[PDB]
Each structure stands twice: as structure tokens, then as C-alpha cells.
Design a protein around this ligand. Structure first.
Ligand SMILES: *[C@@H]1O[C@H](CO)[C@@H](O)[C@H](O)[C@H]1NC(C)=O
Ligand SMILES: *[C@@H]1O[C@H](CO)[C@@H](O)[C@H](O)[C@H]1NC(C)=O
Ligand SMILES: OC[C@H]1O[C@H](O)[C@H](O)[C@@H](O)[C@@H]1O
Ligand SMILES: OC[C@H]1O[C@H](O)[C@H](O)[C@@H](O)[C@@H]1O
Length: 606
């Protein structure tokens, strides 16, 4: 269609499938393998990206251009990588991915939303959708076009260090929370064919249903381990939300490190190709986890050549290498030149990657929009996060005995009150893993409001607020307090670091609760990524609130504690009596919960 030098793949008015076929037909083998290669920004340089025809970059947890970097620093980093990719012969823009799993959580100043488990407590899919919307804007504020979210694992055992990333042990709740997808990506068209990728354009991002499949069903919740269960159980529990993701046009799927009945997911052709691609009709791209193909073997990386062959023949399209890109490209190249991996497999992988890039508009807007910088940490997104945090809270107890005055809601006006505990004034603890650092961190890591600051922000100006992290019972008994708010719980963790057979909160925790509650009527705010052993906290406490990992906006906690809103959350998981009951999920014959899934007390606004 006219102009000197016309190249159909560069024509924005053409259909995606023609632009894909047109571009695919021009590419060398090296250009093709390039597209299949995702590398860490930590190893990337303009020359590396140009010379290896690289298709994708990522930031892993904690991989930032620097500490405290502004939105525009992120945009400059991404645009600098992108300019190297656009200067290739074919000018194929790279796509940059990051774990924005509760907001754009690696970035200083980004709104941090509650983690998934707390979101499942809300039973509010429209809320999760609005969060996907906000998170897409804060990701695009940093120039990034691709979020590795949602995690739609169905965590069947909270001893797993990723239970907090699962909305529920019940797949129906997880299915309903796949509304994150159209939030991140935009709503699919009226027509839409299930399994096609969709992103609306430059204010949205490609999403990633992960980790396929059965990540939440491992033996003893051991991370990355073996999910021992029949096809019918896999399809009834772990698969269904992937079908909802197909219907919402999810752009990519990431494969799990985990195994199904002893078969590595990264080497499972029947599931990845037979099921995901040929039965669900997924037409987006399939991406490995981080060094996921290495972990196919034991030890990991001990036959990288087999890892490439296995993963690529299984049906994976893009490999999150992410460091050893030279080996990866050299080996896949040798497999193809040797006729061990057919060119049809390479072409299918590249078709899929290009299909997502054209569809999302990446060829038309390869570069960041500087005007989006101000979306980062935007007050309206914080207000949404605050609404979420509040809705995620589950009131487990409100009065020590059924005859006591309900402690909650607390009055805003009182002569003097006490805020206490390891988690009452620690932003990093309230956000948990995947915040600033991969494992999360302690202290004031970003912009946010702690529980202490929120209480000071909410109380009547005549109310005196005292903070004491770990006071003794005498300090409390002597202080003239009307009541105390005490926050304790788990420390931030992520992945295998959080696998935990005992599920008891660290000390001091319990002993601060007991010291405070023994001296004044107390409301205990428990911060955790999962149910933990809770009977001793309960026995000590007048009221107790499971606040999960509510994120950066601690005013969500106080909004409920002080009665601006009534408590509405309900447990999205079973609260066990003991870890030796585990696993124990709603619907088991088995079933003897301390609090059943769905449990939750309410209050009225004041
Ligand atoms: C499961 O965990 C044990 C270590 O606790 C390990 O020996 C085993 O290989 C793991 N299985 C898989 C499939 O990852
Ligand atoms: C909640 O609201 C209703 C009034 O509509 C009332 O009956 C109930 O006592 C209120 N208070 C509490 C603490 O439930
Ligand atoms: O899978 C392991 C890796 O994934 C994460 O995203 C991190 O950035 C890296 O530190 C960690 O080792
Ligand atoms: O950081 C990139 C990836 O690495 C991690 O190890 C996780 O398993 C995955 O969920 C994440 O998207």
C-alpha cells in the first residue's frame, strides 16, 4: 500500500496475522532464536541486545537501575534498551517484563496493594479488576509493558512459601479473581475468540497467568516440588482458572517449576502443547520460569543441552534464561542446525511472540510515554489500595467471651492509647515479599503509611498516642491507656524461603501480645501471608484481626479498627487447628477447622 520501501509488517493498518507472517518470513535463524530469548537487565547492554536480536528483557525481584530510582529513570533505562533493539535490521521491539504482583512492587514509591490472599478475602472481583487497572498504569509509568501476573495458583497447603500469592484454596474464588486480567490488559472485544492474546494498547500491559500448572498442590507445600494428584483432580482444582484466563485473552502463560506426578512441567509436552495450546487453544506465548529449564535436571543446569531440547520440544516459546544467554542461543541454534528441533517449532514460538507484540501495539509504541510518569504512586491508586486493605481484613474475634463488650470499633477520642508490636511501625513487614526486594525487607523501604502512622492520622487531636514496640506488662498496666492496638506476625518471605512446616509467628510476637493484653484491653492485628498457629494469640486478645499483607496503605487497617467502615472480609482459606491436620481444605471428608473457609465477623460503621 504505497510509499517507497514498504514493508507490510511495519504497516499499522494491517491485520496482526499478516504482520506476523510477513515479519516471520524475513527472519534469519539467529533473529528467530533472539525473539525466543529473555535476559535479565543485569546482563544486558546495547550491543548484546543488538548483536543477539534479543526479544525480551526482565527485571527479576530487586533488579532495579538503582535504589530509589524515579519513574523517569526507569523509562530511560527501558528506552535505552529499546533503542538498541529498534536499531536491528528488522527493528523488532523488545518487550520488558517484571513481577508487578501487588502493584509495581519493585519500584520505589509505587503503590503497594494487598497480596492475593487478602484480596481473596474481599470476595470482590471488581475491586481486583480496578487494581489490575491501576497496576497497569503504574507499570507503564516506568516504561514497562509486561507484568508477570496473575498468579492463579490454588494453594492447597499453607506451609507453601507462596500461599500469599494465591487468592484461595478454593478454585472458584481464584476463577473469580482472574478479573485482574482485563484490568491489566483491557477488556477483550465483543467478538473475541477464547485463547487469543489481547492487550488494548499503550496504557495497558500484557499479563501472565502463572504458574502452569498445579504450583499450589505440592506435597507438604514444598515449593517447586511434586504435585501428586490424578488428571481429574488436576482439572477440577488446578486447571479451571486457566480456562477463565483464556476467555479473558491473557497474553502469556508462565510454566511452573513444579512437577505433576513426577513429570517436570517445563518438559511436559502433553500439558503445554497437548492441553494448553491444542485443547484450550492458547494463541499467546508460553514463557519459562526463571532458570526453569535448568531445573528440569538434578542438579539444576547439569545438562543444559537436554534442558533446551526438552523445554523447546515441550512447547515453550520464550525462555527466561536469563543470564547465560550465549549458551542458550548457541545450543538452540545447534539443535536446529542439527535437525533435532524442527523449524516448524521455532516458527510456532516466534509466531506467538510476535502475535502478542503486534496485538499490544508494541511496534507502534516501542518507547515509554513520559507523561505516564505521574501515574506512579498516584493518590487515587493509594486510595484504592486503602479500600482493598480494609476489605481484605478478616475479624476473627471481637470480645474475649460472648458476653463482653465488643472492642471494635474503637473510639477516635480517648485520653490515651497504646500502639505496640514489631509490625505496628514497619512498612516492609506490612508489605511482605515482592516488595522493593525480592524477599521483601524490613523498615521504611518505600512510600507508605504504617499502622502507627495511620492511627496518628485517624485519631481525634486530643487523643495521645504512645508507641512502644515490645513493652513489658508493667509499662502497660501503669500507662493509663484506654486501649491498645498491637500488631505482630510473619516476616517478609518469598518462594522457598517461606516454606514452613511449623507456621508459628516469630517471637517476640506472642509475648508482646500477652504483655499488652494483660495490662489493657487490646486489639491484635495479625500480619501474615497465610493462616498461622493462632490459639494463643486468640486466648490473649480481646479482638483479633487477620490483616494478611495489606501493603503500603496502612490506613485501610484503621479505617476498620475505628469504624469508618464495617469489617466485611471472609477467610479465603481454612484456618487449621494444628499443622498436623495439613493438608485440610474446604470440602474434604477429613474437615476439622478452627475457622472454616468463609468465616468472618462483621461490625457496623460508626
Ligand atoms: C521434592 O522435595 C525433595 C526435597 O525435600 C526432593 O528430594 C525432591 O526431588 C523434590 N521433588 C521434585 C519433583 O522437585
Ligand atoms: C448494626 O446495625 C443494625 C441497625 O441496622 C443494628 O440492629 C445492630 O445492632 C448494629 N450494631 C451492631 C454492633 O451490629
Ligand atoms: O528464581 C530465583 C530468582 O528470581 C527472582 O526474581 C530474583 O530476582 C533472583 O534474585 C532470584 O534468584
Ligand atoms: O522474577 C521472575 C520470576 O522468578 C521467580 O523465581 C518466580 O517463580 C516467578 O513467579 C517470577 O515471575
Amino acid at each position: 500500500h504505497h510509499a517507497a520501501d514498504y514493508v507490510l509488517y511495519k504497516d499499522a493498518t494491517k491485520p496482526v496475522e499478516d504482520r506476523v507472517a510477513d515479519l516471520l518470513g524475513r527472519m534469519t535463524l539467529a533473529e528467530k532464536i533472539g525473539q525466543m530469548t529473555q535476559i535479565e537487565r543485569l546482563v544486558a547492554t546495547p550491543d548484546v541486545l543488538r548483536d543477539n536480536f534479543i526479544g525480551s528483557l526482565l527485571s527479576g525481584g530487586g533488579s532495579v537501575p538503582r535504589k530509589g530510582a524515579t519513574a523517569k529513570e526507569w523509562q530511560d533505562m527501558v528506552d535505552g534498551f529499546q533503542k538498541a533493539c529498534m536499531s536491528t535490521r528488522l527493528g523488532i521491539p523488545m518487550i520488558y517484563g517484571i513481577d508487578a504482583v501487588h502493584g509495581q512492587n519493585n519500584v520505589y514509591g509505587a503503590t503497594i496493594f494487598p497480596h492475593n490472599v487478602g484480596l481473596g478475602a474481599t470476595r470482590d472481583p471488581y475491586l481486583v479488576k480496578r487494581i489490575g487497572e491501576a497496576t497497569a498504569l503504574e507499570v507503564r509509568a516506568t516504561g514497562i509493558q509486561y507484568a508477570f501476573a496473575p498468579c492463579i495458583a490454588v494453594c492447597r497447603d499453607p506451609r507453601w512459601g507462596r500461599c500469599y500469592e494465591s487468592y484461595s484454596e478454593d478454585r472458584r474464588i481464584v476463577q473469580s479473581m482472574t478479573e485482574l486480567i482485563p484490568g491489566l490488559q483491557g477488556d477483550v472485544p465483543k467478538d473475541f475468540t477464547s485463547g487469543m492474546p489481547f492487550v488494548a494498547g499503550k496504557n495497558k500491559v500484557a499479563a501472565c497467568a502463572k504458574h502452569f500448572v498445579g504450583d499450589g498442590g505440592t506435597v507438604d507445600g514444598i515449593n517447586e516440588n511434586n504435585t501428586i494428584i490424578n488428571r481429574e483432580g488436576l482439572m477440577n482444582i488446578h486447571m479451571p482458572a486457566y480456562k477463565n484466563a483464556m476467555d479473558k485473552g491473557v497474553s502469556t502463560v508462565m510454566i511452573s517449576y513444579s512437577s505433576w506426578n513426577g513429570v517436570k512441567m517445563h518438559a511436559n509436552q502433553d500439558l503445554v502443547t497437548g492441553y494448553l495450546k491444542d485443547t484450550l487453544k492458547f494463541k499467546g506465548f508460553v514463557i519459562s520460569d526463571y532458570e526453569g529449564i535448568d531445573r528440569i535436571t538434578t542438579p539444576a543446569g547439569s545438562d543444559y543441552s537436554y534442558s533446551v531440547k526438552a523445554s523447546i520440544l515441550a512447547g515453550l516459546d520464550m525462555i527466561m534464561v536469563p543470564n547465560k544467554y550465549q549458551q542458550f542461543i548457541s545450543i538452540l541454534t545447534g539443535h536446529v542446525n542439527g535437525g533435532v528441533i524442527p523449524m516448524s517449532r521455532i516458527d510456532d514460538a516466534v509466531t506467538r511472540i510476535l502475535r502478542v507484540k503486534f496485538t499490544m501495539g508494541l511496534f507502534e509504541n516501542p518507547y515509554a510515554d513520559p507523561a505516564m510518569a505521574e501515574q506512579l504512586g498516584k493518590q487515587e491508586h493509594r486510595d484504592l489500595a486503602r479500600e482493598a486493605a480494609r476489605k481484605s481484613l478478616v475479624l476473627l474475634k471481637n470480645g474475649k467471651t460472648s458476653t463482653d463488650a465488643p472492642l471494635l470499633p474503637l473510639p477516635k477520642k480517648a485520653p490515651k492509647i497504646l500502639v505496640a508490636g514489631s509490625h505496628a511501625d514497619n512498612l516492609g513487614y506490612q508489605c511482605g515479599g515482592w516488595t522493593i526486594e525480592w524477599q521483601g525487607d524490613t523498615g521504611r523501604t518505600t512510600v507508605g503509611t504504617t499502622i502507627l502512622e495511620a492511627v496518628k492520622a485517624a485519631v481525634d487531636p486530643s487523643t495521645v498516642v504512645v508507641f512502644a514496640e515490645n513493652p513489658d506488662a508493667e509499662f502497660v498496666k501503669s500507662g493509663g491507656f484506654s486501649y491498645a492496638i498491637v500488631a505482630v506476625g510473619e516476616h517478609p518471605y518469598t518462594e522457598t524461603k517461606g516454606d514452613n512446616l511449623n507456621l508459628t509467628i516469630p517471637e517476640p510476637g506472642l509475648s508482646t501480645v500477652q504483655a499488652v493484653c494483660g495490662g489493657v484491653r487490646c486489639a491484635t492485628v495479625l500480619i501474615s501471608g497465610r493462616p498461622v498457629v493462632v490459639q494463643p494469640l486468640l486466648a490473649a486478645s480481646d479482638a483479633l484481626v487477620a490483616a494478611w499483607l495489606p501493603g503500603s496503605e496502612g490506613q485501610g487497617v484503621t479505617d476498620a479498627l475505628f469504624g469508618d467502615f464495617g469489617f466485611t472480609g471472609r477467610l479465603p482459606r481454612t484456618w487449621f487447628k494444628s499443622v498436623d491436620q495439613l493438608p485440610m481444605n474446604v470440602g474434604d471428608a477429613h474437615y476439622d477447622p478452627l475457622f472454616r473457609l468463609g468465616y468472618g465477623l462483621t461490625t457496623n460503621a460508626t
